[PDB]
Amino acid sequence: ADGVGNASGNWHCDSTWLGDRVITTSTRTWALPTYNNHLYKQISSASTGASNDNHYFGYSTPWGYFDFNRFHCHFSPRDWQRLINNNWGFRPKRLNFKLFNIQVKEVTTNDGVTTIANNLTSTVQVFSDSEYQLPYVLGSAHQGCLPPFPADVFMIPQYGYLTLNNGSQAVGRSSFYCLEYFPSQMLRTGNNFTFSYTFEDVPFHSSYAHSQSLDRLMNPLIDQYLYYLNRTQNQSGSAQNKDLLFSRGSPAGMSVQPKNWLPGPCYRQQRVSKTKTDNNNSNFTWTGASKYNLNGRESIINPGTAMASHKDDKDKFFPMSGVMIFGKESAGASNTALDNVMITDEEEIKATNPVATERFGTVAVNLQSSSTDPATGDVHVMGALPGMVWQDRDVYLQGPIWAKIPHTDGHFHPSPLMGGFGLKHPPPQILIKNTPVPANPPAEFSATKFASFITQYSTGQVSVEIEWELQKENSKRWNPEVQYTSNYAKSANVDFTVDNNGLYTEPRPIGTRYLTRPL
């Protein structure tokens, strides 16, 4: 239960702050079509003339899925502000899902005149793959998430997946999943669906920027008790003579003092400028791109290793594929102008992580001697070395929240490369589909496959509640900190607001790293 003329759920949609806790609960109203005419279909790069690196094999499903894996699905711009401006970190604790006031309509089109009526007896099916038995497509930054603006109605994305492929063909080990082979709950107007999940223990997300840097971590007023080789050729003597002179760590030469740690790992990336003139005249997008080679296919590393987007005084350049880029509502599908996208800046970590477009360092390459000169080389790729420390890619008000850690034998610091929390057991995929309704069948039994169905779609609200744990700050810093603030200068439109046509717009990407914390 209960009934047809009885709401099966209310509009819960608030935000509650409780010291070290904050419950965000937002509800949006959705629309679900009938996909593929209730058919599972094999799909492939086959006959697309697709590049060799773009081949793929998989299946498109008749099911739709719920996806709220974006911060703006839960935090209003103002809340996000509250969060990033006063806390050193946060993480998800537990969540709550709910489907209600579901209504199934049946459209009868004819003579251009289409009519929409209720089919009070139709059902919609749901089920959460809580045992992760289906391929996981959440956490690949796809569209179809809950809209940022509560007053927006959205369309549920269609669920499709991929599997092992050799060119545009499949292989023996390829897998095909049928979602109807999963116990799922059926609903009619008066029914509703609910379910709760608990997040696994996960590190707080570092919502702060360091107020010191690895190199500058010593006492500016005092020497060290350590010495380093300072000269191998004596100064003057009106001749250049071989020697071995040592000096001891001085504040006057911090760049040469023995230290305890190393910058973060790094996989260098090409650098491009926001002013076309500076760029080389060619299309190096794929040519000079940092790609990884997985079984014959190349794939751009994007955004790849967390690295400072640019060195100080140069928010002019950016890693060719080392920064998150969101599109403004104006941006088109492909080859859209620069001012139609928003490129994130990850320079807040230049204090501990290597800059993405530069060399990580220099390495000795030979054995110097009186007869052969000491040579070196530039290291462009650097794996994990003991003593390394680093910061992970920051998250954004419109970025991903989590991603499922692949189920592999081993894995290194599994933090989703494009921002987020790495979960061994993430929130499960919620699958929904309209059950088929056979149109009038022949008056004489026919065994051939049924392919005539009442055309219909469904609609209802969905509520998602998440309890977040805050990590308050207690900086003993004396001077004011940086804080996200809307510009007070007058203008035609207000940031994160609708316009004269009712189109909600997210002007810029907001990070979370404003508050300071020493190393």
Ligand X SMILES: Nc1ncnc2c1ncn2[C@@H]1C[C@@H](O)[C@@H](COP(=O)(O)O)O1
Binding residues are 411, 413
Does residue number 502 form part of the binding site for ligand CYT (CB under 6 A)? no
Per DSSP, what are the bridge partners of residue 24? 15, 466
Does residue number 315 form part of the binding site for a copy of itself (CB under 8 A)? no
Does residue number 263 form part of the binding site for a copy of itself (CB under 8 A)? yes
**Pick from ligand CYT, ligand X, a copy of itself, none: which does 202 bind, CB < 5 to 8 A by kind?**
ligand X
- Binding site per annotation, positions for cytosine: 411, 413
Instruction: Decide whether 21 or 116 has the Cβ nearer to a copy of itself.
Output: 116
**Pick from a copy of itself, ligand CYT, ligand X, none: which does 195 bind, CB < 5 to 8 A by kind?**
none
Instruction: Tell me how far, at minimum, the Cβ of 424 lies from ligand CYT, in Å.
Output: 12
Among 202, 289, 388, 417, binds ligand X (CB under 6 A): 202
Instruction: Decide whether 159 or 199 has the Cβ nearer to a copy of itself.
Output: 159
Instruction: Tell me how far, at minimum, the Cβ of 136 lies from ligand X, in Å.
Output: 14
Which candidate, 240, 394, 384, places its Cα nearest to that of 307?
Answer: 394
Interface segment toward a copy of itself; rule CB under 8 A; list 91-99, 154-162, 194-202: 154-162
Task: Report how far residue 173's alpha carbon sits from residue 40's, in angstroms, rounded to the nearest whole number.
Answer: 19
322-267-392-274 Cα dihedral, nearest 10 degrees: -20
Residue 190 neighbours by CB under 8 Å, 6+ apart: 1, 2, 3, 4, 6, 8
Residue 408 neighbours by CB under 8 Å, 6+ apart: none
Which positions from 353 through 392 interact with ligand X, judged by CB under 6 A? 392
Does residue number 421 form part of the binding site for ligand X (CB under 6 A)? yes
Per DSSP, what are the bridge partners of residue 103? 459
Count of residues interacting with ligand CYT (CB under 6 A): 4
Spell out a b/e string for 89-116, using b for 16 or more CB atoms within 10 Å of the CB, else e: bbebbebbbbbbbbbbbbeeeeeeeeee
Instruction: Decide whether 128 or 269 has the Cβ nearer to a copy of itself.
Output: 269
Instruction: Tell me how far, at minimum, the Cβ of 384 lies from ligand CYT, in Å.
Output: 7
Instruction: Decide whether 414 or 507 has the Cβ nearer to ligand X.
Output: 414
Task: Report how far residue 308's alpha carbon sits from residue 356's, in angstroms, rounded to the nearest whole number.
Answer: 6
Which positions from 386 through 445 interact with ligand CYT, judged by CB under 6 A? 410-413
Instruction: Decide whether 392 or 506 has the Cβ nearer to ligand CYT.
Output: 392
Other beta carbons within 10 Å of 168: 16
Among 167, 414, 436, 507, binds ligand X (CB under 6 A): 414
How is 230-266 classified by DSSP, letter by letter?
A: EEEEES-TTS-EEEEEEEE--GGGGGGS--S-B---E
**Pick from a copy of itself, ligand X, ligand CYT, none: which does 170 bind, CB < 5 to 8 A by kind?**
a copy of itself
Does residue number 236 form part of the binding site for a copy of itself (CB under 8 A)? no
Instruction: Tell me how far, at minimum, the Cβ of 428 lies from ligand X, in Å.
Output: 16
Interface segment toward ligand X; rule CB under 6 A; list 278-286, 374-382, 422-430, 487-495: 422-430
Interface segment toward a copy of itself; rule CB under 8 A; list 90-98, 194-202, 375-383: 375-383
Instruction: Tell me how far, at minimum, the Cβ of 203 lies from ligand X, in Å.
Output: 5
**Pick from a copy of itself, ligand X, ligand CYT, none: which does 398 bind, CB < 5 to 8 A by kind?**
a copy of itself
Estimate to the nearest angstrom the gap between the alpha carbon of 130 and the chain centroid.
22
Instruction: Tell me how far, at minimum, the Cβ of 197 lies from a copy of itself, in Å.
Output: 19
Is residue 349 a contact partner of residue 308, using CB atoms and an 8 Å limit?
yes
Is residue 453 a contact partner of residue 447, using CB atoms and an 8 Å limit?
no
Which candidate, 391, 387, 353, 390, places its Cα nearest to that of 261?
Answer: 387
Residue in the structure block whose two tokens are 């109203």: 29
Residue 244 neighbours by CB under 8 Å, 6+ apart: 229, 231, 232
Instruction: Decide whether 172 or 410 has the Cβ nearer to ligand CYT.
Output: 410
Three-class SS of residue 277? helix
Task: Report how far residue 208's alpha carbon sits from residue 518's, in angstroms, rounded to the nearest whole number.
Answer: 10
Binding site residues, ligand CYT, CB under 6 A: 410-413
Binding site residues, ligand X, CB under 6 A: 200, 202-203, 392, 405, 409-410, 413-415, 421-424
